[PDB]
Write an enzyme that holds these catalytic residues in place. Structure first.
Site, PDB file in Angstrom:
ATOM      1  CG  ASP C  32     -83.266  87.330  42.951  1.00 36.68           C
ATOM      2  OD1 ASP C  32     -82.299  87.757  43.617  1.00 36.68           O
ATOM      3  OD2 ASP C  32     -83.140  86.875  41.794  1.00 36.68           O
ATOM      4  CD  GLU C 124     -87.542  91.054  36.336  1.00 37.33           C
ATOM      5  OE1 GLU C 124     -87.532  90.530  35.202  1.00 37.33           O
ATOM      6  OE2 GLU C 124     -87.870  90.441  37.373  1.00 37.33           O
ATOM      7  CD  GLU C 133     -90.718  85.216  31.131  1.00 36.47           C
ATOM      8  OE1 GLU C 133     -91.439  86.216  31.353  1.00 36.47           O
ATOM      9  OE2 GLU C 133     -90.071  84.628  32.020  1.00 36.47           O
ATOM     10  CG  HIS C 281     -85.352  85.004  39.972  1.00 35.19           C
ATOM     11  ND1 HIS C 281     -85.070  86.313  40.303  1.00 35.19           N
ATOM     12  CD2 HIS C 281     -86.115  85.053  38.860  1.00 35.19           C
ATOM     13  CE1 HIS C 281     -85.628  87.116  39.414  1.00 35.19           C
ATOM     14  NE2 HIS C 281     -86.271  86.376  38.530  1.00 35.19           N
TER      15      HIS C 281
HETATM   16  C1  78V Z   1     -89.497  82.714  35.562  1.00 39.71           C
HETATM   17  O1  78V Z   1     -88.086  82.722  35.725  1.00 39.71           O
HETATM   18  C2  78V Z   1     -87.610  83.831  36.434  1.00 39.71           C
HETATM   19  N1  78V Z   1     -87.966  85.087  35.770  1.00 39.71           N
HETATM   20  C3  78V Z   1     -87.902  85.093  34.413  1.00 39.71           C
HETATM   21  C4  78V Z   1     -88.408  86.091  33.683  1.00 39.71           C
HETATM   22  C5  78V Z   1     -89.017  87.145  34.395  1.00 39.71           C
HETATM   23  N2  78V Z   1     -89.654  88.150  33.771  1.00 39.71           N
HETATM   24  C6  78V Z   1     -90.341  89.226  34.465  1.00 39.71           C
HETATM   25  C7  78V Z   1     -91.726  89.415  33.888  1.00 39.71           C
HETATM   26  N3  78V Z   1     -92.683  89.776  34.936  1.00 39.71           N
HETATM   27  C8  78V Z   1     -93.198  91.144  34.867  1.00 39.71           C
HETATM   28  C9  78V Z   1     -94.681  91.173  34.540  1.00 39.71           C
HETATM   29  O2  78V Z   1     -94.859  91.594  33.175  1.00 39.71           O
HETATM   30  C10 78V Z   1     -96.138  91.156  32.790  1.00 39.71           C
HETATM   31  N4  78V Z   1     -96.251  91.258  31.338  1.00 39.71           N
HETATM   32  C11 78V Z   1     -95.610  90.507  30.389  1.00 39.71           C
HETATM   33  N5  78V Z   1     -95.892  90.851  29.154  1.00 39.71           N
HETATM   34  C12 78V Z   1     -96.782  91.902  29.303  1.00 39.71           C
HETATM   35  C13 78V Z   1     -97.445  92.723  28.370  1.00 39.71           C
HETATM   36  N6  78V Z   1     -97.332  92.582  27.047  1.00 39.71           N
HETATM   37  N7  78V Z   1     -98.245  93.698  28.850  1.00 39.71           N
HETATM   38  C14 78V Z   1     -98.375  93.830  30.174  1.00 39.71           C
HETATM   39  N8  78V Z   1     -97.808  93.114  31.147  1.00 39.71           N
HETATM   40  C15 78V Z   1     -97.015  92.164  30.642  1.00 39.71           C
HETATM   41  C16 78V Z   1     -96.252  89.745  33.356  1.00 39.71           C
HETATM   42  O3  78V Z   1     -97.619  89.397  33.546  1.00 39.71           O
HETATM   43  C17 78V Z   1     -95.499  89.876  34.693  1.00 39.71           C
HETATM   44  O4  78V Z   1     -96.405  90.001  35.782  1.00 39.71           O
HETATM   45  N9  78V Z   1     -89.035  87.195  35.723  1.00 39.71           N
HETATM   46  C18 78V Z   1     -88.504  86.182  36.449  1.00 39.71           C
HETATM   47  O5  78V Z   1     -88.442  86.211  37.677  1.00 39.71           O
END
Ligand code: 78V
Ligand code: 78V
Ligand code: SAO
Ligand code: SAO
Lengths: 341, 343, 343, 343
Positions: C32, C124, C133, C281
């Site tokens: 993206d 992000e 989420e 996205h």
């Molecule tokens: C799916 O539709 C599109 N979309 C929607 C939402 C989104 N959100 C980003 C989230 N990723 C960032 C990363 O944080 C990670 N994590 C999420 N919660 C976490 C936590 N409590 N501690 C550490 N890491 C954490 C998760 O595993 C991800 O790899 N990204 C997208 O592209």
């Protein structure tokens, strides 16, 4: 009389009032397919009219009687119950045919004719053929027919075929869903949603359509006017077994009709099929409240039951099922209240 | 009863069969101007309803009674003669207002109500306001109204104005001339041409039009529902003297109507004028048999006489003359059988 | 005992972090260009907010944002990631010769311990309709590691909601629900479940894009300031709205999108998912009404969008909307965890 | 219970949440081949059901039980673990079948049946038959089957065949090569290219294909549900020796399955073969990491080993070699996370 016994006064008033208007006569007359086919049927079978006595049941403007006159009929009794009879007489006089066309004001079930006739002519067909119940007057008029006399039309074929038309279905469902509202200006209408669906789907849809929406070759039901009696049309049971040619949703049954003028020189057909040029009868479709899914090769079986009512129309009961799966649909329609689309 | 005595039964049968359909009720309900304006009039005048006894004449689905309930009415008698009463009963129950709304199946002229009411509500207006003759049912119901009670709507104005529409006029002859041919499939139809013309001119035309066809400010005839009697609507004589704003051929008269809800807090107007958003009433035009030429500044005077018949409608008699020239034209029309022209 | 585990059903967490353990998904997010490019722009154009600073990257995934922070001159970057993507990030840190500057700390940000307090948090954490989420709470939770004078990238998030009309979408869903309307599916009467089915289908927010002309009013904005907000602030999010309708028609529901702002010392950089901007996205999200509300232009559509966080890392959405002029009201419940991807 | 011991709670929760949706049930019900064939199998073998005691394992909406009722069954116990059980009960009531169908909420491994049954019906087939591990529940349910009772389906055939599809193969690298760039926004991603390739090849590909990609007659592995035990499906070894009909590159193995309802009157087949009309099972292809060249007449021999895991799926190990050349290829696949490729 037979007419009044089977007819509510309220309906009769409105009915003959409707046909008292010159504009409606014009409307029917300007249907060139209809008028032209009738004239063709009568004139090309001129020998069935030459020096014969004719009965025209419901002559309206008298057009069919004039056709009968053109074909050489000696004397034509033109029976008409509405106030159109007066105008027909005017036309008889202005066309100098007083010696051959005789207007008889009144219902064919009630007037008296001086003699028996050689042939009966009429155009008594309504929506889905049977609407208006005039076929019964036409058949009733056979009390005036000589033993070996003839009828124009001679037979009538009703065609039934299953169709798919999602937009029509959702078009009606959309209308019914008004009553789905939980807060229309603050009012909960939902309790009437069922009644609304019933009311809307009880309406046969009058209009035309592309022939490819048809999912099977039509089934034919034939009424032989030479043989049939009035009572035969009080309860009309049409069983059907469709061999599905296409897979999909069957949203209901489509109806049209043909009539045949079986004359001595040739047989002339008047058709309201969707394959033929459009007429003012168009075609009629009865929707299922819920469509039936069928695959090509399946058989769609059931019955279309038509019950004549005192409002000069029919209560329509359609029951259909996909034999292979037992998927069944039952429906009730009021032919008196159609939807002109 | 008063209703049956003034109504051919056939017409009544047809009439109440018509309103027994949810689709027709829906048709009326989806007219946002109509329904919304009724709601506005009722709610914005809540002091005219709060803790009041209300009579809803011809409640249909019961919508106006629900509006009356929203405004705080203590008790609402909702009278309905068609089979729509059954569905109204259902809606009253499903909206948990059985303690406040009582559906009474039957004609308002025939049923018995237990008590006098503080205010009557209804939507009894037809084409040209008066068509269907329900206004008479509305006024009749005042036998149940307290001497100091109110009527919603309180007044009704019918507006008449001269119009020019050459194409509309010529249309009648274009259609009638179908019969003016010596050999329609070998048949000479011409002898019926006159009758066809007559028939078309007897039909009031229901549809809408551009306001620029209007040649004079309308003349207004007012019915005050608080003061008027039933009998006042059996013969309605609307004299008119129009001050022409434009020069040209006057082909006939255009009709529309307004109703006013005069409440304690404010007056709310519902208008079917061609200057306003379209309603299911549209507008109505009655043609002169012969157009009249009028100059700007000239006066077009005459009378529109509405004679009630037992077919729940009116025979319309129009006589008009240009005072400056004496050119005169009249027409007689059957309002029960109008021509729906709108496209 | 961590806040994460206390607010999250394990079943949801396992699935959640397995989802992000896939490189294909990282690729999906990284490709993206609007997102990635805008993040890089925000970080690099505000390089002085990073130069020689301590950084925390919450949910680093592949580690891209930490690399952006490294490019901007950050002294030390702690890259926290709970999924198995943490190992792949380590690989990239080594192969990009940044072992001295980027430190991957595997685990949940609510559970790991960082060696020191940071000057700025980058992340992000935005999901569908921004809040899906529940990662914003991890983002806010991470502020226990933020110096008093610290910053957040993004700094604020704007949620925009606006009423829309889309008959075809509505009918598209209703058609699906109408399967359970059948009285004889292979001889079986399913109709008793149609109500449950309509509910289920309309419980789904529609994720996709649309023409801006379906919007019937200027959007309403709800702003979350990440510098100021607390975790607990996002357990119950109440968004009241009062729309001034610009067009007449059926309102079929509410459309949602969001912007985030990187408020740096040099400039403010915006990342927008609005339907007026290039598609991301995240697309846009629409919540349908079970019954549309009719409103004419000039009317007011008022009510509240209420989001209640659940233990499945998402929100229960209750939308209540009303046409003020008519009292026409609609209530709806949606499950943000189970949306319908229509694109 | 036997179920919980072989299943991670995370997987179970997700699994039964998935089937709790009416839309998913609808998806299965709308598969006409599946549903229609089940109905045919049951009704055309009415003597296997007339006045019999029936068990429906995982009844979902309850459709198969209604089929059993149509066939004249005396009593049907319909066991269902998801929340679809609530809806099934509703359908039994609304179809006036409370006296013959008894919905039992819960897992078949945990609930108690009041009596032994004459026949078990179920639809426990997943992708390449074994996915979801529901066959074990089906077999487990035989503790309630009278000796010489019957099973519908009675047997399941898994078919394996070598295929050639150059484009499918190259697609994997096309996608993985995203990571093979030295400066994605300044970041060298190349070190993860290998991991990306691995991840992609671990996904079985779900979709359909032209039968002309098949290079040899399929090999069949049969499970006789009347004879098999649960444990038999924990380790499934499918040896194969394909006799190549065409010369070319073998890119992997294609999988489909048939099930047979062996009734007293007739045997009815439900097939998901690529020669048959498409079902929601489609077909499944497992790629080799390296294609194998084979000449027509050569022999491709080896083993497909399916090892059940606690995520209600299988770890797939495939080893194949061309006997004539000794050219060898292996792959390891995760059936729980397949790639839905169908368009
Ligand atoms: C799916 O539709 C599109 N979309 C929607 C939402 C989104 N959100 C980003 C989230 N990723 C960032 C990363 O944080 C990670 N994590 C999420 N919660 C976490 C936590 N409590 N501690 C550490 N890491 C954490 C998760 O595993 C991800 O790899 N990204 C997208 O592209
Ligand atoms: C709305 O679609 C158009 N349409 C439909 C049906 C139809 N039917 C033809 C039958 N003519 C009826 C004419 O006989 C008259 N009468 C009808 N029934 C009569 C009776 N029992 N005795 C005497 N006359 C009778 C009636 O007044 C009419 O003039 N013709 C049409 O073009
Ligand atoms: N004399 C009468 N007594 C009772 N109901 C009548 C009478 N005349 C007409 N109606 C009913 O009056 C209604 C007029 S339509 C208006 C219906 C409703 N109040 C609304 O505003 O939507 C129809 O439903 C007729 O059936
Ligand atoms: N161990 C189990 N016990 C009970 N139900 C189960 C079990 N495992 C899976 N199921 C259910 O079995 C169903 C498989 S889908 C087949 C549903 C239905 N019999 C039809 O033919 O359409 C789903 O509804 C699952 O929730």
């Amino acid at each position: 009389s037979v007419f009044s016994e089977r007819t509510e006064e309220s309906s009769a008033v409105q009915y003959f009032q409707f046909y008292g208007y010159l504009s409606q006569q014009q409307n029917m007359m300007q249907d060139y397919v209809r008028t032209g086919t009738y004239q063709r049927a009568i004139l090309q079978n001129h020998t069935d009219f030459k020096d014969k006595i004719v009965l025209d049941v419901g002559c309206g403007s008298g057009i069919l009687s004039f056709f009968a006159a053109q074909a050489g009929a000696r004397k034509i009794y033109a029976v008409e119950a509405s106030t159109m009879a007066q105008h027909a007489e005017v036309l008889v006089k202005s066309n100098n045919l007083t010696d051959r066309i005789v207007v008889i004001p009144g219902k064919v079930e009630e007037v008296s004719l001086p003699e028996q006739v050689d042939i009966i002519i009429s155009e008594p067909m309504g929506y889905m053929l049977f609407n208006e119940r005039m076929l019964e007057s036409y058949l009733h008029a056979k009390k005036y027919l000589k033993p070996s006399g003839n009828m124009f039309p001679t037979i009538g074929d009703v065609h039934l075929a299953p169709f798919t038309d999602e937009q029509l279905y959702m078009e009606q469902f959309t209308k019914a869903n008004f009553w789905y509202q939980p807060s229309f200006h603050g009012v909960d209408l939902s309790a009437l949603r069922g009644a609304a669906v019933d009311e809307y789907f009880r309406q046969p849809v009058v209009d035309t359509f592309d022939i490819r929406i048809l999912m099977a070759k039509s089934v034919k039901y034939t009424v032989n006017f030479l043989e049939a009696k009035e009572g035969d049309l009080h309860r009309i049971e049409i069983p059907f077994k469709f061999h599905m040619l296409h897979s999909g949703l069957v949203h209901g049954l489509a109806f049209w009709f043909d009539v045949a003028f079986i004359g001595s020189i040739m047989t002339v057909w008047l058709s309201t099929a969707p394959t033929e040029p459009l007429t003012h009868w168009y075609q009629v479709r009865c929707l299922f409240q819920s469509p039936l899914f069928a695959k090509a090769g399946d058989t769609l079986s059931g019955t279309c039951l038509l019950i004549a009512n005192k409002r000069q129309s029919y209560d329509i009961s359609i029951v259909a099922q996909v034999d292979q799966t037992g998927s069944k649909s039952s429906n009730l329609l009021d032919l008196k209240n159609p939807f002109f689309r």
